[PDB]
Amino acid sequence: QQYTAKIKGRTFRNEKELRDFIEKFKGR
Structure with a gap:
């Protein structure tokens, strides 16, 4: 039970x- x-x-x-995913999603 987390994300x-x-x-x-x-x-x-x-x-x-x-x-930290959107940071590496080239979008931030």
Whole structure:
């Protein structure tokens, strides 16, 4: 039970990674 929000298409282990995903998404 952490972060299943499949934004671009990925489930994250925590908000921090979900926040570090858009950083590497070339969008920020």
